[PDB]
Design a protein around this ligand. Structure first.
Ligand code: DGB
Ligand code: DGB
Lengths: 471, 469
């Protein structure tokens, strides 16, 4: 069973001996710190952490003793605030005397703004605010996946609008293939859920149960999949029987969309001769609601996409749409799901545009790039103390390292506001109290062991919409 | 609760309908495919077998849940309810799978078979690749362990060169990665992988994983040290940094303590606060309880070098037997910002050029150690190599025309020692020719049971550096 006393950076066990004596309040905040582009971030995932790990009776006698026993050996020393944890157990029935205020989930906020704040609600528990830094900072991951996924949606929207005149099907154009490429089962659920903030297609099934339990949707499920082959279901037929494999698979899935990985031996042969000639009659007969989707999976991603489109365009009836771009027949599409990240996605769609191929023709799968190849420094997600009360006097505190101004933190009590022009601003030094800037956009989401304000996944999706979708 | 029927890539739900009719066996293998990182540490499969694959993993309720979810997820009924029911009824929900693997902690060159998977009941031909997704997640502990060991090699080389020995090596790279990983579960897994090579970690989650799944003779596999963070310095107020420092070193007067010193001005902190105002509180400390000064910003090499130059003029420096400079034993440095395998190399080489012993310093690494890694780094990959259809075995493989690096191995595989004592993987069942001695893979899982396992102490032994041995 999870033990919050064993869920912090080891050194934090020692911090109750380090704060100034007579400190009754430690107040800290989280931001995606600005860096001298990812200019705005999607706030998502705190609600998961609050419910799974922080709410309710999280301290017990047994948990205190287990931590005491572990830390004794881990430090080869007795440092450990047994009395402080005892206090929470006795006085609050093991509920954390902490108040957390946050911007609503799904909100899209520029870099360098306060996203949430954390403070103790009992003077005895001044040490607790930063104890939970470690667990709360892991919110970096769903924030960063959701943000990077949204930035890819923006690229897709731009090019789809340019080459087709509308955004039909945008939400299906980036498909999560990342389950095997993430570091754990828990990470898979969290990351998949964050991608679904922006899109509707995923093979990372773990995201579904996460969303159902912690957020919820009106619809039965938040994400969808489609039948598809893997190399094993092709190669198992034998090298001389690739066509037999293709024929069997498209016939098994004759009335639903089906993707068939076509690069086991020679992608270009498969497109030109197997799909384009030998099995063409099984493809041109298909429904618009049940296309064949050809899936390359190797080679230079742009070069391969372009050559695949070139081959198909000569074997199948191509039209030119109202924008002047080439369009495959509706029973045939392509998905590129190898080596796709935000940079290569851009290169591919721009390449297609230059060769006059509509983005209607293609969708993308992304695995490692979408869910794993991300770190906490991408958006500089960071948690810092900005205000303490010592001997009954509040003081505004901060770091400001001489050699790195980018690491300077904010001072004092903070609030987030709309500007007169409709943008965002973070007020420092308790200045929000002057009420010159309308209401604080941070809301209490956690107080004294209870989750006080929750968002459905539908609300989050609405909050994270692109401007172009709004238009 | 975990449900293995909902723990695969969605498209694999549809694969039972795509294999050749009358297929009775699907046999697959995992390798770190050949294309830096010439050899990999095999670690973490045992965690997966015990936590997710062993025992009764199918129930009626689990089957109904998955059926209900997939109906909505596909907007269609494609789920193999019959196949999962067969496992439940015939085997009391235990997986009819056999997995063979190299021993954990083993250090093996790229492009070798590390484990194999096959069904033990013809009805369950589809099950081999159902569990691809979970098993392939072993990439992460393999990669963390491997990259951590590569850093130990660097530290070993330079500590040996600058000091003449390896004393303390296992304390020189400290895991700071807990906040920087993607989840609690990842934290435990990755921290445990670093502990294959080192003994210091602030990622507490790894201790419990190791105790539950591997075990050590010692009470715990990893250790920590008291240390400040910016909040315990800055809370004192900007004009009271000296007060914070004094309080902290006085509270921790008889144990090692690290104190982050760059809140406002690292160079001032070192030269004036530690080097002058509080010097008397440092030179009185025990060799068993040094002050460790922690910079945390600026260019990592430049800042380490300047910090060392400052301390060397404020404190008595000696020259060790190798000709390198050494701080007094009550004073050390830890650099824990921006450290990855590349910057680690740059720092120690820069220290060596300026005649500073590696004895003076340790490294903390967070995102670099536990998060900034992908499955592409070692090309960790699972592929089918052998099938039996209509009673005939067939060697199968992929070999994409545009990328020879993605070519996979053919047929039944085995791992052997060569005459020179190296590893070789034999394909096409050739291990059965008995020209290369015994298969080095062992059966680790069979029909719901873990059949062979390793303590964390043995894993550490297997993962030792040549220089250590
Ligand atoms: O190939 C796999 C999964 C592979 C996988 C999974 C997991 C791990 N590793 C690999 N899944 C098949 C997805 C095919 C979906 C198609 C794409 C083309 N398409 C559009 O572009 C579109 C047309 C009209 C409107 C909107 C979009 C129509 C829908
Ligand atoms: O500063 C932190 C943690 C900060 C943190 C944690 C978590 C997250 N984010 C930040 N931990 C302090 C560790 C200090 C250990 C010292 C290093 C110097 N040293 C040697 O080099 C050595 C000398 C002789 C023999 C062997 C080694 C002696 C041991």
């Amino acid at each position: 069973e999870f033990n919050i006393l064993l869920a912090t950076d080891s050194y934090k066990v020692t911090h109750y001996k380090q704060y100034p004596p007579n400190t009754s309040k430690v107040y800290s905040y989280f931001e995606c710190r600005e860096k001298k582009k990812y200019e705005e971030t999607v706030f998502y995932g705190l609600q998961y952490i609050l419910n799974k790990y922080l709410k309710g009776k999280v301290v017990t006698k047994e948990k205190i003793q287990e931590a005491k026993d572990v830390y004794k050996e881990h430090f080869q020393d007795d440092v450990f605030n047994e009395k402080g944890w005892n206090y929470i157990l006795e006085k609050y029935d093991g509920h954390l005397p902490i108040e957390i205020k946050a911007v609503p989930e799904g909100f899209v906020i520029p870099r360098g703004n306060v996203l949430f704040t954390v403070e103790n609600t009992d003077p005895e528990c001044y040490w607790l605010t930063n104890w939970i830094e470690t667990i709360l900072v892991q919110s970096w991951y769903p924030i960063t996946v959701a943000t990077n996924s949204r930035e890819q949606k923006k690229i897709l929207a731009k090019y789809l609008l340019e080459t087709s005149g509308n955004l039909d099907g945008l939400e299906y154009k980036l498909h999560d293939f990342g389950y095997r490429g993430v570091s754990s089962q828990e990470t898979a659920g969290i990351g998949a859920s964050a991608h679904l903030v922006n899109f509707k297609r995923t093979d990372t099934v773990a995201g579904l149960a996460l969303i159902k339990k912690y957020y919820g949707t009106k619809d039965p499920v938040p994400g969808y999949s489609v039948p598809a082959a893997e190399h094993s279901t092709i190669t198992a037929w034998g090298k001389d029987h690739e066509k037999d494999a293709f024929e069997h698979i498209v016939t098994q899935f004759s009335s639903v969309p089906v993707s068939v990985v076509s690069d086991s031996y020679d992608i270009y042969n498969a497109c030109e001769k197997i799909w384009g000639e030998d099995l063409r009659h099984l493809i041109v007969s298909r429904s618009t609601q049940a296309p064949l989707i050809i899936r390359p999976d190797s080679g230079n991603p742009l070069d391969t996409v372009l050559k695949v489109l070139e081959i198909l365009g000569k074997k199948f009836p191509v039209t030119e749409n109202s924008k002047g771009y080439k369009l495959l027949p509706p029973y045939l599409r392509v998905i590129q799901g190898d080596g796709v990240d935000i940079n290569t996605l851009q290169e591919i769609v721009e390449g297609m545009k230059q060769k006059m191929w509509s983005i209607e023709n293609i969708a993308f799968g992304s695995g490692g790039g979408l869910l794993q190849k991300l770190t906490r420094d991408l958006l500089n997600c960071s948690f810092k103390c900005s205000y303490v009360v010592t001997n009954g006097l509040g003081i505004n505190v901060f770091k400001d390292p001489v050699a790195d101004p980018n690491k300077r933190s904010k001072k004092g009590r903070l609030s987030l506001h709309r500007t007169p022009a409709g943008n965002f601003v973070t007020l420092e030094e308790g200045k929000g109290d002057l009420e010159e800037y309308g209401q604080d956009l941070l809301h209490t989401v956690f107080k004294n062991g209870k989750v006080t304000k929750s968002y459905s996944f539908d609300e989050i999706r609405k909050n994270a919409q692109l401007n172009i979708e709004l238009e």
